[PDB]
Design an enzyme around this catalytic site. Structure first.
Site, PDB file in Angstrom:
ATOM      1  N   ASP A 134      37.043  27.713  44.547  1.00  0.00           N
ATOM      2  CA  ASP A 134      38.112  27.690  45.537  1.00  0.00           C
ATOM      3  C   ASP A 134      37.543  28.112  46.890  1.00  0.00           C
ATOM      4  O   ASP A 134      36.683  28.992  46.949  1.00  0.00           O
ATOM      5  CB  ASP A 134      39.256  28.614  45.110  1.00  0.00           C
ATOM      6  CG  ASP A 134      40.524  28.390  45.914  1.00  0.00           C
ATOM      7  OD1 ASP A 134      41.345  27.541  45.505  1.00  0.00           O
ATOM      8  OD2 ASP A 134      40.699  29.060  46.953  1.00  0.00           O
TER       9      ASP A 134
ATOM     10  N   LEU B 109      43.697  43.423  54.034  1.00  0.00           N
ATOM     11  CA  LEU B 109      42.777  42.315  54.263  1.00  0.00           C
ATOM     12  C   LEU B 109      43.308  41.370  55.335  1.00  0.00           C
ATOM     13  O   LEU B 109      44.046  40.430  55.037  1.00  0.00           O
ATOM     14  CB  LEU B 109      42.519  41.553  52.962  1.00  0.00           C
ATOM     15  CG  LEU B 109      41.470  40.439  53.022  1.00  0.00           C
ATOM     16  CD1 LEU B 109      40.141  40.974  53.533  1.00  0.00           C
ATOM     17  CD2 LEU B 109      41.300  39.785  51.657  1.00  0.00           C
TER      18      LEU B 109
ATOM     19  N   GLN C 171      40.268  47.249  53.773  1.00  0.00           N
ATOM     20  CA  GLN C 171      40.662  48.101  54.892  1.00  0.00           C
ATOM     21  C   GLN C 171      41.587  49.217  54.407  1.00  0.00           C
ATOM     22  O   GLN C 171      41.737  50.250  55.064  1.00  0.00           O
ATOM     23  CB  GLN C 171      41.347  47.273  55.985  1.00  0.00           C
ATOM     24  CG  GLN C 171      41.609  48.034  57.277  1.00  0.00           C
ATOM     25  CD  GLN C 171      42.416  47.232  58.279  1.00  0.00           C
ATOM     26  OE1 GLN C 171      42.809  46.097  58.011  1.00  0.00           O
ATOM     27  NE2 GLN C 171      42.668  47.821  59.443  1.00  0.00           N
TER      28      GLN C 171
ATOM     29  N   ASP D 161      37.393  39.031  44.461  1.00  0.00           N
ATOM     30  CA  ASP D 161      37.336  39.198  43.012  1.00  0.00           C
ATOM     31  C   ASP D 161      37.888  40.559  42.613  1.00  0.00           C
ATOM     32  O   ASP D 161      38.504  40.703  41.559  1.00  0.00           O
ATOM     33  CB  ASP D 161      35.903  39.048  42.494  1.00  0.00           C
ATOM     34  CG  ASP D 161      35.493  37.600  42.317  1.00  0.00           C
ATOM     35  OD1 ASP D 161      36.386  36.742  42.170  1.00  0.00           O
ATOM     36  OD2 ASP D 161      34.275  37.323  42.316  1.00  0.00           O
TER      37      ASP D 161
ATOM     38  N   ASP E  45      35.173  41.798  34.917  1.00  0.00           N
ATOM     39  CA  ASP E  45      36.626  41.874  34.805  1.00  0.00           C
ATOM     40  C   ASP E  45      37.175  42.909  35.785  1.00  0.00           C
ATOM     41  O   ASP E  45      36.923  44.104  35.637  1.00  0.00           O
ATOM     42  CB  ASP E  45      37.035  42.228  33.371  1.00  0.00           C
ATOM     43  CG  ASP E  45      38.501  41.939  33.086  1.00  0.00           C
ATOM     44  OD1 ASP E  45      39.319  41.935  34.029  1.00  0.00           O
ATOM     45  OD2 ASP E  45      38.837  41.716  31.903  1.00  0.00           O
TER      46      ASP E  45
END
Length: 290
Positions: free
Chosen positions: A214, A13, A81, A259, A273
């Site tokens: 956030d 990432l 990626q 997530d 989850d």
């Protein structure tokens, strides 16, 4: 060990070894996979746009895992990626790879990456739209780094996610890719198992707010609006159908892009989850003889 082959986690990432500055990439996932009776190793790669070069780095790490464990193959699990590096190693050296699992992988490119590059030309996009893509990207970089980052310091890394860049990679290593847009690919190709799962967000700006999240998740909300094709089915960086690889276990989970790796620090912004998906996948690999 409940599995026959070890698991190698592959990050990818924008060239970040860890999220937020200190938090591990696959947060609490390695400990969970081990709790399910699996040996886990975290691949160390460099911030490169070439998946062939990043794949060679992954190839070296895999051979170091085989040397320490004595195992013939490993199970590759990559994020964003990541899977591209995994797909390279599986294509060039299938005898060393048991399975390739894609988690919110950029298998067909990112519509976000296609938009931000267009903001470099003054006039290519409306000034408001161009500034919006750069502002959101800067917010993403700052959150990932844990410190103020300018969007220009991450453009080069974002270029590797473009639809044109991934399409060139896909035409060279098409193993596991879907035959049609929205469909699935072959589960078993050349003795290698291909799996994938991903998520989408249900975000309507006219009814849902973003003052309690956030900045890492806020950037995902901003970018999801800026999607062109998969506007109503993406995780903030990659569309649902763009993430399909091999057998799609489920690409419509309640997860954004970060997530999927239990960020930030276990505080997800949605309902699914993330960790349990990794745990259940261990049982899936085990039943396949992997």
């Amino acid at each position: 060990s409940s599995l026959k082959f070890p698991i190698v986690l592959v990050h990818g990432l924008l060239g970040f070894d860890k999220i937020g500055g200190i938090y591990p990439y696959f947060y609490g996932i390695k400990e969970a996979l081990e709790k399910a009776g699996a040996k886990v190793y975290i691949a160390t790669l460099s911030a490169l746009n070439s998946n062939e070069l990043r794949g060679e780095q992954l190839l070296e790490f895999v051979r170091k895992v085989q040397a320490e464990t004595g195992a013939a193959k490993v199970n590759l699990i990559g994020h964003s990626q990541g899977p591209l590096a995994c797909r390279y190693v599986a294509a060039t050296h299938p005898e060393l790879i048991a399975s390739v699992t894609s988690v919110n992988g950029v298998n067909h490119g990112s519509e976000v990456a296609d938009l931000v590059r267009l903001a470099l030309t003054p006039g290519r996009l409306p000034e408001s739209i161009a500034n919006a893509a750069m502002s959101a990207f800067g917010q993403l970089l700052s959150a990932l780094a844990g410190s103020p980052r300018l969007p220009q310091s991450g453009i080069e890394a974002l270029e590797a996610l473009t639809s044109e860049g991934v399409a060139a990679f896909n035409n060279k290593y098409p193993q596991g890719l879907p035959a049609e847009w929205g469909g699935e690919g072959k589960e078993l190709v050349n003795g290698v198992y291909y799996y994938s799962w991903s998520g989408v967000i249900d975000y309507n700006p006219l009814h849902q707010g973003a003052n309690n999240l956030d900045p890492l998740h806020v950037a995902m909300l901003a970018f999801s609006i800026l999607f062109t094709n998969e506007r109503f089915q993406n995780d903030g960086l990659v569309g649902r159908y763009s993430s399909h690889l091999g057998k799609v276990i489920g690409s419509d989970y309640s997860m954004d892009h970060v997530d999927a790796i239990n960020q930030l620090a276990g505080v997800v912004a949605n309902n699914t989850d993330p960790v349990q998906l990794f745990v259940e996948h261990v049982a899936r690999l085990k039943s396949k003889g992997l």
